[PDB]
Each structure stands twice: as C-alpha cells, then as structure tokens.
C-alpha cells in the first residue's frame, strides 16, 4: 500500500504537462525513498529522469516498492481535473490494477481511478565538460526562437546557441535571473530543437534550468523541483556524417 499526499499538487500537474507529449507509457518507480520515473521518449533520442523525493511530500508511505505502468496522457487528463491549488493524494495497493488520485479543494473532493498498464536504460557516470545555469524562460525562448530558424541548434560554450535553415541563420550569445557557466573545456554540440522544445514544457517547474554538456555525450537539461527533487532530460546529440 502506497499513499503520498502533496499539498502543492500543481507540481504533479506541471510534471505531467512536461512529460505527456514526450512519453506514451512509462513506469513510475514508487519506493520508500520516493517516486522515480525514468523513460526514453517515444522517438528514442532522449531519456527522461524524474525524481520526487519522499520528503517533498507532506505525507508519504510505501510499505513495499511498486512499479506502476502508467499511460502518461491518461494521467495528464486526470490531473487536468485537479484544481491548480488542490491537495493531491496518490494511493495504490499491491497488485494494483489502478492508481487512485484524490483531489481535495481548499467542499469539493474528486476521486479518480486510473487503470494501470503492464510495462531498462542506465545513466552512466559523467563529468560534464561544461555546465550552464540560466533562467528557464530564457532557455525556452532560445529554443523557441531558433526553431523558427532551423531544426538543429549548435550549442557552443559565454554560451552560444546557433541555428541555420533556408531563410538564414542565427546566433544567440549568453554570458554571465542569472546565467552562470562552469567550463572545464570548450564544447560544441548539435541537438534537435524539436526535442529541446519538448523539454522546455517543464519550464513552469523551476525559474532556472541547467544544461550539462560534454563532447559526444547526451546533453542534460535539468529542472529542479524545489524541495521535491528534479526533472532531468538527456538528449542524444546529432553527429556529423
């Protein structure tokens, strides 16, 4: 039997708004330490790692670990029925065919049962040659803007984001609310803006975002969820033929 009460239910709403358009079916790893979700996107170019630590919940209980296969869109739909200031409680039993979502308004209580599905990849140890901390909104604006220019962004790290298409090209230069760069080596990597634009759907989770880079390894776009944990996207690079 698992039960997690969250008073800032908006967090879970924002989380699933961030994931629904990138992963169809994903397994939620529920443990005593908290909720874990790790899933490739449907395109097999990225890896999402979500961590909500038990501490971040207002009450949290998980007698035995449980892996709930979840259709993220259906869970998205159910969470759109939660008031943006509702108290969300998650509730599962062992061998559950169903995850219970209870939305308490601060005299309306909504009880949802979501049918669970029956449903692998390891994150290596990596020192990142370059790590960029910047406002999440600015990063989303960059990846939105450059997608009008091209399909690919070359990230050069001062960090430069450059795209080119038929109409021309664009270079966006940020240097050091704040933007900070820890650079142990200069890196230049190319990534599909389409997937970075999926990642920035997590922008409501945090005012800032961190981009971790290293030569010829996946890019890490990390959105920390204040207190609870984080939402991490790893994006396989584009490589020159």
């Amino acid at each position: 039997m698992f039960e997690a009460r969250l008073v800032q239910g908006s967090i879970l709403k924002k989380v699933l708004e961030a994931l629904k358009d990138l992963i169809n079916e994903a397994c939620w790893d529920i443990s005593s330490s908290g909720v874990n979700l790790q899933s490739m996107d449907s395109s097999h170019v990225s890896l999402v790692q979500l961590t909500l630590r038990s501490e971040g919940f207002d009450t949290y209980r998980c007698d035995r670990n449980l892996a709930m296969g979840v259709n993220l869109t259906s869970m998205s739909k159910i969470l759109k029925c939660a008031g943006n200031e509702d108290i969300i409680t998650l509730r599962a039993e062992d061998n559950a065919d169903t995850l219970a979502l209870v939305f308490e308004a601060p005299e309306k209580v909504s009880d949802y049962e979501m049918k669970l599905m029956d449903l692998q990849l390891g994150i290596p140890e990596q020192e990142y040659s370059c790590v960029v901390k910047m406002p999440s909104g600015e990063f989303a604006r960059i990846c939105r803007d450059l997608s009008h220019i091209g399909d690919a962004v070359v990230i050069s790290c001062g960090v430069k984001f450059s795209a080119s298409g038929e109409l021309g090209n664009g270079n966006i230069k940020l240097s050091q609310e704040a933007v900070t760069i820890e650079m142990n080596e200069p890196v230049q990597l190319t990534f599909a803006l389409r997937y970075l634009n999926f990642f920035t759907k997590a922008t409501p989770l945090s005012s800032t975002v961190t981009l971790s880079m290293s030569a010829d390894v996946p890019l890490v776009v990390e959105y920390k969820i204040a207190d609870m944990g984080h939402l991490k996207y790893y994006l396989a690079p584009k490589i020159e033929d």
Partner: peptide, 13 residues
C-alpha cells in the same frame, strides 16, 4: 548531421 538514438550512448546493465 544526423540524429542518434539515446540507446547508442546509454546502455542497459
């Protein structure tokens, strides 16, 4: 330039 799969970078146990 060509997109690569995340599984061509990350592995399983």
């Amino acid at each position: 330039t060509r997109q690569t799969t995340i599984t061509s970078h990350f592995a399983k146990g």
